[PDB]
Amino acid sequence: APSRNGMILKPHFHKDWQRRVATWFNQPARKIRRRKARQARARRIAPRPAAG
Amino acid sequence: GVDIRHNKDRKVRRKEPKSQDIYLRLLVKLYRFLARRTNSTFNQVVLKRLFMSRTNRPPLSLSRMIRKMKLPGRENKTAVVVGTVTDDVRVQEVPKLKVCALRVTSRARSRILKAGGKILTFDQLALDSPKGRGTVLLSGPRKGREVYRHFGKAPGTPHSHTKPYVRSKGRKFERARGRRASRGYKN
Amino acid sequence: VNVPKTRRTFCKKCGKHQPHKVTQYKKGKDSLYAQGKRRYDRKQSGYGGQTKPIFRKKAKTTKKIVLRLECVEPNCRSKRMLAIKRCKHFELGGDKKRKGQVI
Amino acid sequence: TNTKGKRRGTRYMFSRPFRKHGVVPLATYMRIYKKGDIVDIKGMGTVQKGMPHKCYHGKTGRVYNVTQHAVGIVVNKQVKGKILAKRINVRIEHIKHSKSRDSFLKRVKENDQKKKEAKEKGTWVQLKRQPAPPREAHFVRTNGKEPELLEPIPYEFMA
RNA sequence: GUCUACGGCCAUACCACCCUGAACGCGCCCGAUCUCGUCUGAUCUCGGAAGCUAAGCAGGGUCGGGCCUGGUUAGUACUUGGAUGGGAGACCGCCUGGGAAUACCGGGUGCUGUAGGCUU
RNA sequence: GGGGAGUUUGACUGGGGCGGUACACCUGUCAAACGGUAACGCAGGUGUCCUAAGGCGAGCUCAGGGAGGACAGAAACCUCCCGUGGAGCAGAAGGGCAAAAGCUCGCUUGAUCUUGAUUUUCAGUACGAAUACAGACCGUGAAAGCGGGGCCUCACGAUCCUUCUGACCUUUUGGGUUUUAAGCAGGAGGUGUCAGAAAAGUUACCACAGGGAUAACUGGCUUGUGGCGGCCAAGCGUUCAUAGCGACGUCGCUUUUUGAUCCUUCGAUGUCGGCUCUUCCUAUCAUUGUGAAGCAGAAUUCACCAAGCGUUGGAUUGUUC
RNA sequence: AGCCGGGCGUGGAAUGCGAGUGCCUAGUGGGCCACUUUUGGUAAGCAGAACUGGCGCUGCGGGAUGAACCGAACGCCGGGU
RNA sequence: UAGUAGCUGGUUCCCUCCAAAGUUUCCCUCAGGAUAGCUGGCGCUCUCGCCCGCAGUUUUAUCCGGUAAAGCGAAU
RNA sequence: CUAACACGUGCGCGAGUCGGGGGCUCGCACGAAAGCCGCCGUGGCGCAAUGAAGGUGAAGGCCGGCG
Ligand SMILES: [Mg+2]
Ligand SMILES: [Mg+2]
Ligand SMILES: [Mg+2]
Ligand SMILES: [Mg+2]
Ligand SMILES: [Mg+2]
Ligand SMILES: [Mg+2]
Ligand SMILES: [Mg+2]
Ligand SMILES: [Mg+2]
Ligand SMILES: [Mg+2]
Ligand SMILES: [Mg+2]
Ligand SMILES: [Mg+2]
Ligand SMILES: [Mg+2]
Ligand SMILES: [Mg+2]
Ligand SMILES: [Mg+2]
Ligand SMILES: [Mg+2]
Ligand SMILES: [Mg+2]
Ligand SMILES: [Mg+2]
Ligand SMILES: [Mg+2]
Ligand SMILES: [Mg+2]
Ligand SMILES: [Mg+2]
Ligand SMILES: [Mg+2]
Ligand SMILES: [Mg+2]
Ligand SMILES: [Mg+2]
Ligand SMILES: [Mg+2]
Ligand SMILES: [Mg+2]
Ligand SMILES: [Mg+2]
Ligand SMILES: [Mg+2]
Ligand SMILES: [Mg+2]
Ligand SMILES: [Mg+2]
Ligand SMILES: [Mg+2]
Ligand SMILES: [Mg+2]
Ligand SMILES: [Mg+2]
Ligand SMILES: [Zn+2]
């Protein structure tokens, strides 16, 4: 029920949103893995540009 | 039994800053002493404004300060503001001023120093003028915050130019029934 | 009520009082391709039965009838809608009544 | 509950006084109201145009706008726990200059005059209206006739 | 003393009957070509000046009606506030303040503004 | 197309239901001399009507009564006099109105286009209704003026959708033309449960969450109704108001009748009778002791102290009766 | 009517008292009783209103007892009334 | 599926200060909500140690009313 | 507890502000932390509103030159 004054809100939480939740606790590990793969490819292509 | 009411018995004004930093509290000590051992009320006003909160110490712009100090009679006096002096970019000519403030923007300080004025802090202000003679006490626009556009007489009510709380501005958001004579009524 | 077939009244296009021929406004035939109608058949088509409400609790026995005015000036011939209060029986320019006759 | 009609319960308030029906005397029409006069409201049922609502009958307001036939006046109305100073338009028949202000105006002129006078004389004069003071001491002279006795009369039934 | 034109307050000015009106005025009054309108020049409109205060109108009168203003009714009726007052109740008394209205008995019977006359 | 599916089956409310609408409005009263103020309080009205019954101007005065005039009369038409409204103004009521707001004529369409402000219910929001203006086009009158509906107080309707009207109007999405469609502004078509859902029943086969906010027992307050008792004394009693009664009145008592209410109890106080058994009340049927009779005796009445002791056996009916 | 400029302070009744203003906001939206006024009802510890004060939210002295009556409202104690 | 419940029941330490409402309007609204009202908290702008204002009060002026009473030799 | 919003408070910077995503740092006890990027500010919020839309889009006041 509306209080005295405020904004009308439409939260999009009428589905089973708690089953599909993407936590980001693997973000630093993902960054580390991407780095390691990047340096591995850079070593693999010996004199070639690393960027491509 | 005494026929009295205790509703407004306790006054709500601030006795001390809610902040916890030490520099402001040292300033408060100094100006407490000055206010209670000097008859000048400038010290009392400055101490009271030191007590106040951030939203009650709005920033003062360079254009406002030069505009209020260019008035006749108040030449070569020190402009005292308890807030923050922010730079105004839509002003080219800046004179030499004697400013005192708690904190000054880097660009504003550069502008004043280049123009030739000097920046003072409330400590050195105490040394220069304990009772504060030759001071022009200014303040920023307190009603400048945008929250004040939502206050007052409610919208959707005749002769009320109050901003509603809308999540997005557009033609589909609060424009149909109470805002048009074509659809229902117009307030 | 009785209303004459001619009325000298203001004309928006002419910007002055002009004679007007008046008739009774009747509702036009509902176009099949209005946006509301198209949305209505799009929603009704398929399964689920009736979707929008059907009004049934009629209560009023009369309705405000509208006079369609037309400026008699051939160059202008603009038209305007004019409505007056409700009436059960209504006629246009019939048997202008006279007083003090035999009942 | 009751009815919200605009003229409910006004059969005596908007009626005319006894043996005073008929043509409105023209002096009411021939009075001048300017901006800022204190004026009284008294609804007159003889004319129905511009009749004030019954809740302003007997109220005193201030004129803020003058128009061909009517006058706009600001008057206070007590609504629940608050008073609103609202402005209403009343035709000139239902209105009448308030004499509560002219007494104060005349007093102002008179004490200003007596202040201007005696200023050169240096004497003291009282201007504030003091409340009725207690009676001072005096002598009541009997003229040789002694006051007569007063006694209650005996009960004896009338009806 | 007073009238006419326009009024203000709208009976202290109205209503009924009776008496008196110098001068001006207001009227009644005499006619229907024109203006105008009617069944009818009765009304209205128009053109006049033989006669008259008869009437209107003005002033006055009535142990007049009414109206206006006082006394009486009356500190009665009613009523703000108070009591661990009375009474089975209905109601009543007191304290603190305010305070009416008929019947009945007196007095009065238009004031006045602007302009213009008459009383040479 | 109830074979089957989903769903609904208003509210108010001296329990609910039936009844009614007090559910949207208006008049008088309640209402306690500002305003506001309740009940299924009282008396009533509305969902319309009007090309004039709107707007001006002019001229007349109504209801009723008295006195007269061929048919003519109680009432047909004409004349005079009186006539403060006792008539009329569409409707309920109230207010208002006399060279008018009434009656009769003349001319008209201010019932027209448009932006704002204000009042009424009010939250001081809408709708509805209304009030002063202002800007154009007009009507009427010689004119001053008056008029943007009805003398005032009531006669009415959001969003979404549809329909009509308006502009050398905007968009119709890569550009251009034309149909079409969508916009902008103003009306209409509703929601009367009238601030506006699209809606039939039954359940004793029933279920759940609750409710003593609410019914069906008792118990409380009340006592109309029931029952019982007084005072007055018209009359009855052959004569005699009061041996015994007692009209027309009027004052009470009781809670063994019924009502009225809804205070307790709905996480339950086992809801008719009969059988059995005890105790209590007296408003006494009998017995003990008395007083009065229209008490000769017998029998029988009325009254007093008085509840100690008794107040049965059966047919019919579940019965209380 | 609005503008400017100028002159007037015995601050023009009594009494009392600092005042104005802005945000955010919980609970509540079953009430009951009493003097007086008052509607329905035969009446009711009934039903319905107006004003004020109470109870609810409140203990204390008195009315033996008691939500509302009379007195009086409350920190822990001594004395007095 | 820990389905929904305007409906019952429960809802855990101390002291200090302030302190209510059962009323208005709308709602298929009447055991509930929204909105005013009543509350608290946070402040802020000034003020006195000549003067400003305000008031559940009085006084002096000035208007407003149709109840109590009274009247029917006044209207209905 | 998460998300959104409103308001009040504390801190930094301030017409700007914010690396949250990514990358560079010999990856790695703590460390999945911390530091840095500035030609990684893309971008968000703010700095301009109004209109349905086509669109438009935020002072002026005095003297000399033909009251
Ligand atoms: Mg809430
Ligand atoms: Mg104390
Ligand atoms: Mg407080
Ligand atoms: Mg199909
Ligand atoms: Mg003649
Ligand atoms: Mg004469
Ligand atoms: Mg004569
Ligand atoms: Mg007389
Ligand atoms: Mg004269
Ligand atoms: Mg002579
Ligand atoms: Mg079925
Ligand atoms: Mg009153
Ligand atoms: Mg006329
Ligand atoms: Mg006009
Ligand atoms: Mg009419
Ligand atoms: Mg069966
Ligand atoms: Mg109960
Ligand atoms: Mg006999
Ligand atoms: Mg038991
Ligand atoms: Mg049991
Ligand atoms: Mg006995
Ligand atoms: Mg009660
Ligand atoms: Mg309290
Ligand atoms: Mg108490
Ligand atoms: Mg006792
Ligand atoms: Mg003690
Ligand atoms: Mg749970
Ligand atoms: Mg409920
Ligand atoms: Mg409950
Ligand atoms: Mg009354
Ligand atoms: Mg009476
Ligand atoms: Mg909030
Ligand atoms: Zn035209």
PDB file of C-alpha atoms (C1' of nucleotides) and ligand atoms in Angstrom, chain F residues 211-213, chain G residues 30, chain H residues 7-8 31, ligand 29:
ATOM      1  C1'   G F 211     -16.891 -14.064  15.787  1.00  0.00           C
ATOM      2  C1'   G F 212     -19.839 -13.545  22.232  1.00  0.00           C
ATOM      3  C1'   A F 213     -18.443  -7.044  17.234  1.00  0.00           C
TER       4        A F 213
ATOM      5  C1'   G G  30     -14.578  -1.104  17.437  1.00  0.00           C
TER       6        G G  30
ATOM      7  C1'   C H   7      -8.869 -13.688  10.304  1.00  0.00           C
ATOM      8  C1'   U H   8      -6.835 -16.165  15.672  1.00  0.00           C
ATOM      9  C1'   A H  31     -13.420  -7.326  11.510  1.00  0.00           C
TER      10        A H  31
HETATM   11 MG    MG J  29     -10.409  -8.975  16.570  1.00  0.00          MG
END
